[PDB]
């Protein structure tokens, strides 16, 4: 027959940001 | 800083901390590691359910009681909480406060102990948008000048996926292997921890009871370590007796309770069977034997296999049976699989192997390989089995698979178990295999070229040794050869089909009568021996569908009513009598 | 806690949540598992359509009305929503402190069992780029020391894939499995939601329609499983009849129209074939012979076999009809299954066996196996 090839499957890293808060006074 | 850590010593002193059992050498390792100059931070580094929260909170346990060395003495022991630090930190350099306050507590005492549980989560703290400070940062200073001793836990996954990529934190922490305890430790421990769970249940729970949970759990279940899978077993059993009304009867659990519990985790059949199951077993091969006629043999596997693995006398590890219905086409190799399940009313796991002739095909079943982009959907053979894993396995058309697809059965039949991609092991010990083949069809056609024929039914037996590997014919509990149609079965045939067309006549309100001379003719006209009760249909549909189909949509047939099949032996042709009414 | 969580229980009172009928086996061992000392977290694992959120909804329900076992009694149901959780938490904290306002609450209660339904959902919870601190995490301590309960429902997919690869997690919860009911039970099903379906429509389903939906359902619709798969030929039936009968709406729901909401479901020709279809049964054979002459034969075997499934008397898992059309050149070997569609409105799905010559081509009709391209 014919050779048989594989295909991967890329995973990019995802990420969140939370933030910090600081009173004027 | 209370409201962050609880103290698992007052805990311990008033209500119970679940106390330890033995792990006389892991807590002995313990506490080398915490008396240690520097880097005395014990870590325990464990599969789930091993029980490494018990081992550090159970050593608050001893310290009260006071059975540990007297450096260890008058030690406290808090339990840090990873939510409570987080939970209103908002503003800028909050979390830091919180953190680094506690930690100066711990130094000034210099007695104090903490136990970070689910310790990968301090690994990320307190970082808003690029922050790298953290929980981790901020202790590590502390933990290399050895001021300060925190116990951690973790699991494997968590430990080298998260915990040992951070080099600068492990090295703080000196691993402790926690090795899932033996038979004999587990029962020392849930007769430890019986006084606790009798009382909540107000139950009992017999030495006989105790050890068959651990057996029958490590038997039936795979999926969870031993220490929590007994547990598993003995606290839901007490609940049973509980919820059963008291006026009826509770009084103890039993061994019984403990196979009703271990069934229903696993999904398997109860052991002990009921009555009514028995009547059903018992009959269950005359039901067969009025639907499959000619196959007594097959189905006497079939049933004497179940009713061996339900009395006990059942393969340790393989499956219930593995049966090869090889036999000529049309004989009922697949008629009785498809009527096996029904009657025990177990799902069918019908799998067509003429899709799988390619070796690459192998991935459908136990799934795609890691980092690849079928590795999500799984395999279809273990997600099936993992569902229903009693159930009949039919591999129809086995011979025109790929022979390297017969290899993954191996394991299959020899342990009882199939690998998925992911790494959960299926379990094939209650699943009937079924794997119905056609090899041998051709040669029996052929004719041999000589004055005398031949018989041709040991060719077929050739065949498949030379299709099938030794070793996978060597599993299989034993290889059936289905007869050739007799003419007598084959008149229990056509009545067995006649009676299918009344059902379908039944929902139009169409009755239909049959004279015993008209059914001879019908299976005289289609019986050849090499094609079997499948030609059949067809000169049925032909002589009996097709007049009463067009009467049914343009004649009288169309208001249910009573038609009769007449033999005319002048014309030798069915005479049909629509008696439209 | 309020805004995040609903009381199910509140609910049942005002008839928000629907009647639970049968699950007794189901919900036996869902209170064991809750009595348990430890880990009393009872997960429900099924199939798409099964009932696992109308076993925990039900189980309210069941609360009001009394059915349910002393232990039960007395006690709220609490359904938690992921989002709402998650709203407005962008400061550090936010998630925590709601998170844990919520734990303190139903520990403080002693009664409440809390209800995530796709509980997968919470192992991807709030979280920085390296921050492994979820709700998964924050509530493993509480769910070994049993002082909470908290009921799941999640896919089988969903529990292998996610919840699975969570070891931790999921020790704590017990699996329970729900399976598709039988014929008979979910005939009964229907017949105790059959009041709220009936009073939105304000037509009455008839004992015949019912059970017909679930029999030919099982055998016309696919991929479906069956109670969504009955209800969503009850619920789309009534539909059907208050709005097409503008003038003097049918109030019943005979079986008849029963047959015509699966076919269009299905996309399959509907029992109890029209006046205007029989028509076309009849002359059909003239109207190929028209177009092909000659080679009756072959047009009498597929004239005949469909004739015989939109009877009813064709095979019940088999094809309408397998033929091999072997004969010369010219002869109208495909002409007469191009007309054949024509005549009938059907699509013509013609594939070409040419171009699968080889092994490897079987690939293309199945499909690729998992891992590989294509
Ligand atoms: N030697 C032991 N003595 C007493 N109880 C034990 C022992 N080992 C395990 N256990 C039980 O284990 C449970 C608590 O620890 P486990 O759940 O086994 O482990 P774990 O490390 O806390 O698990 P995670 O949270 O899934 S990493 C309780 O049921 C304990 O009674
Ligand atoms: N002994 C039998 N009793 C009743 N029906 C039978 C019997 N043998 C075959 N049949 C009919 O066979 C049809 C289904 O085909 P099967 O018997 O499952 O075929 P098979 O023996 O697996 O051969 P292949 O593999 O399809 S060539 C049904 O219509 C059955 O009624
Ligand atoms: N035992 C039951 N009694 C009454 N109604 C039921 C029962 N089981 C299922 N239903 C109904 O069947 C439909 C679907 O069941 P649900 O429990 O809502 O499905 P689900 O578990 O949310 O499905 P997903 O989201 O696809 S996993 C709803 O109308 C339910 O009320
Ligand atoms: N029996 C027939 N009656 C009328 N026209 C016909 C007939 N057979 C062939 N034709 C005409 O010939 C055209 C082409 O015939 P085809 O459908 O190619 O024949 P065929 O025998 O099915 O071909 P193959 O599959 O290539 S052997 C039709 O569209 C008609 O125009
Ligand atoms: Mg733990
Ligand atoms: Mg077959
Ligand atoms: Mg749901
Ligand atoms: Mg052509």
Same mark, same amino acid.
């Given at each position: 027959?014919?050779?048989?090839?594989?295909?991967?499957?890329?995973?990019?890293?995802?990420?969140?940001?939370?933030?910090?808060?600081?009173?004027?006074? | 800083?209370?409201?962050?850590?609880?103290?698992?010593?007052?805990?311990?002193?008033?209500?119970?901390?679940?106390?330890?059992?033995? #792990?006389?050498?892991?807590?002995?390792?313990?506490?080398?590691?915490?008396? =240690?100059?520097?880097?005395?931070? &014990?870590?325990?580094?464990?599969?789930?359910?091993?029980?490494?929260?018990?081992?550090?909170?159970?050593?608050?346990?001893?310290?009260?009681?006071?059975?540990?060395?007297?450096?260890?003495?008058?030690?406290?022991?808090?339990?840090?909480?990873?939510?409570?630090?987080?939970?209103?930190?908002?503003?800028?350099?909050?979390?830091?406060?919180?953190?680094?306050? $506690?930690?100066?507590?711990?130094?000034?005492?210099?007695?104090?102990?903490?136990?970070?549980?689910?310790?990968?989560?301090?690994?990320?703290?307190?970082?808003?948008?690029?922050?790298?400070?953290?929980?981790?940062?901020?202790?590590?200073?502390?933990?290399?000048?050895?001021?300060? =001793?925190?116990? /951690?836990?973790?699991?494997?996954?968590?430990?080298?996926?998260?915990?040992?990529?951070?080099?600068?934190?492990?090295? !703080?922490?000196?691993?402790?292997?926690?090795?899932?305890?033996?038979?004999?430790?587990? *029962?020392?421990?849930?007769?430890?921890?019986?006084?606790?769970?009798?009382?909540?249940?107000?139950?009992?729970?017999?030495?006989?009871?105790?050890?068959?949970?651990?057996?029958?759990?490590?038997?039936?279940?795979?999926?969870?370590?031993?220490?929590?899978?007994?547990?598993?077993?003995?606290?839901?059993?007490?609940? !049973?007796?509980?919820?059963?009304?008291?006026? @009826? #009867?509770?009084?103890?659990?039993?061994?019984?309770?403990?196979?009703?519990?271990?069934?229903?985790?696993?999904?398997?059949?109860?052991?002990?069977?009921?009555?009514?199951?028995?009547?059903?077993?018992?009959?269950? +091969?005359?039901?067969?034997?009025?639907?499959?006629?000619?196959?007594?043999?097959?189905?006497?596997?079939?049933?004497?296999?179940?009713?061996?693995? =339900?009395?006990?006398?059942?393969?340790?590890?393989? %499956?219930?049976?593995?049966?090869?219905?090889?036999?000529?086409? /049309?004989?009922?190799?697949?008629?009785?699989?498809?009527? $096996?399940?029904?009657?025990?009313?177990?799902?069918?796991?019908?799998?067509?192997?003429?899709?799988?002739?390619?070796?690459?095909?192998?991935?459908?079943?136990? +799934?795609? &390989?890691? +980092?690849?982009?079928?590795?999500?959907?799984?395999?279809?053979?273990?997600?099936?089995?993992?569902?229903? %894993?009693?159930?009949?396995?039919?591999?129809?058309?086995?011979?025109?698979?790929?022979?390297?697809?017969?290899?993954? $059965?191996?394991?299959?039949?020899?342990?009882?178990?199939?690998?998925?991609?992911?790494?959960?092991?299926?379990?094939?010990?209650?699943?009937?295999?079924?794997?119905?083949?056609?090899? /041998?069809? =051709?040669?029996?056609?052929?004719?041999?070229?000589?004055?005398?024929?031949?018989?041709?039914?040991?060719?077929?037996?050739?065949?498949? @040794?030379?299709?099938?590997?030794?070793?996978?014919?060597?599993?299989?509990?034993?290889?059936?050869?289905?007869?050739?149609?007799?003419?007598?079965?084959?008149?229990?045939?056509?009545? @067995?089909?006649?009676?299918? $067309?009344? *059902?379908?006549?039944?929902?139009?309100?169409?009755?239909?009568?049959?004279?015993?001379?008209? #059914?001879?003719?019908?299976?005289?006209?289609?019986?050849?021996?090499?094609? +079997?009760?499948?030609?059949?249909?067809?000169?049925?549909?032909?002589?009996?569908?097709? %007049?009463?189909?067009?009467?049914?949509?343009?004649?009288?047939?169309?208001? /249910?009513?009573?038609?009769?099949?007449?033999?005319?032996?002048?014309?030798?042709?069915?005479?049909?009598?629509?008696?439209?009414?």
């Amino acid at each position: 027959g014919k050779t048989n090839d594989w295909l991967d499957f890329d995973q990019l890293a995802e990420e969140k940001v939370r933030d910090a808060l600081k009173p004027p006074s | 800083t209370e409201n962050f850590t609880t103290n698992l010593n007052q805990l311990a002193r008033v209500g119970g901390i679940d106390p330890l059992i033995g #792990r006389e050498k892991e807590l002995e390792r313990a506490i080398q590691v915490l008396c =240690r100059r520097r880097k005395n931070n &014990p870590l325990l580094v464990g599969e789930s359910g091993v029980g490494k929260t018990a081992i550090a909170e159970g050593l608050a346990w001893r310290i009260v009681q006071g059975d540990v060395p007297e450096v260890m003495a008058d030690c406290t022991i808090y339990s840090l909480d990873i939510g409570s630090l987080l939970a209103g930190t908002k503003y800028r350099g909050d979390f830091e406060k919180r953190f680094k306050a $506690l930690l100066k507590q711990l130094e000034q005492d210099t007695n104090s102990i903490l136990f970070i549980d689910e310790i990968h989560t301090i690994i990320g703290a307190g970082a808003a948008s690029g922050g790298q400070v953290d929980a981790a940062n901020l202790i590590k200073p502390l933990l290399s000048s050895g001021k300060i =001793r925190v116990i /951690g836990s973790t699991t494997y996954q968590e430990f080298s996926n998260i915990f040992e990529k951070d080099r600068a934190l492990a090295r !703080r922490f000196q691993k402790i292997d926690i090795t899932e305890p033996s038979i004999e430790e587990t *029962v020392q421990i849930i007769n430890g921890l019986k006084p606790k769970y009798e009382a909540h249940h107000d139950v009992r729970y017999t030495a006989k009871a105790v050890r068959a949970a651990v057996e029958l759990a490590v038997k039936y279940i795979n999926d969870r370590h031993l220490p929590d899978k007994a547990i598993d077993v003995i606290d839901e059993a007490g609940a !049973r007796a509980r919820l059963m009304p008291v006026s @009826k #009867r509770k009084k103890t659990v039993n061994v019984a309770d403990i196979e009703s519990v271990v069934a229903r985790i696993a999904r398997i059949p109860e052991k002990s069977v009921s009555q009514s199951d028995r009547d059903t077993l018992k009959n269950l +091969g005359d039901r067969l034997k009025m639907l499959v006629f000619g196959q007594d043999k097959a189905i006497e596997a079939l049933t004497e296999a179940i009713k061996m693995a =339900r009395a006990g006398l059942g393969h340790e590890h393989k %499956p219930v049976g593995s049966f090869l219905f090889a036999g000529p086409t /049309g004989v009922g190799k697949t008629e009785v699989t498809v009527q $096996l399940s029904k009657a025990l009313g177990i799902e069918l796991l019908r799998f067509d192997m003429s899709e799988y002739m390619e070796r690459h095909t192998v991935s459908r079943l136990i +799934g795609a &390989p890691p +980092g690849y982009v079928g590795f999500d959907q799984g395999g279809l053979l273990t997600d099936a089995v993992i569902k229903h %894993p009693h159930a009949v396995l039919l591999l129809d058309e086995i011979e025109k698979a790929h022979p390297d697809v017969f290899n993954i $059965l191996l394991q299959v039949m020899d342990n009882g178990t199939l690998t998925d991609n992911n790494g959960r092991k299926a379990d094939f010990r209650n699943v009937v295999l079924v794997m119905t083949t056609n090899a /041998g069809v =051709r040669e029996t056609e052929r004719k041999s070229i000589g004055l005398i024929h031949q018989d041709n039914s040991t060719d077929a037996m050739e065949e498949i @040794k030379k299709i099938f590997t030794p070793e996978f014919r060597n599993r299989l509990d034993n290889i059936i050869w289905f007869d050739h149609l007799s003419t007598d079965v084959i008149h229990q045939v056509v009545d @067995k089909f006649i009676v299918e $067309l009344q *059902v379908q006549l039944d929902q139009k309100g169409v009755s239909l009568e049959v004279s015993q001379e008209a #059914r001879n003719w019908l299976a005289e006209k289609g019986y050849d021996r090499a094609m +079997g009760a499948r030609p059949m249909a067809r000169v049925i549909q032909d002589n009996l569908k097709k %007049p009463l189909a067009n009467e049914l949509l343009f004649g009288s047939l169309v208001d /249910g009513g009573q038609v009769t099949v007449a033999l005319d032996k002048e014309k030798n042709e069915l005479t049909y009598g629509f008696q439209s009414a």
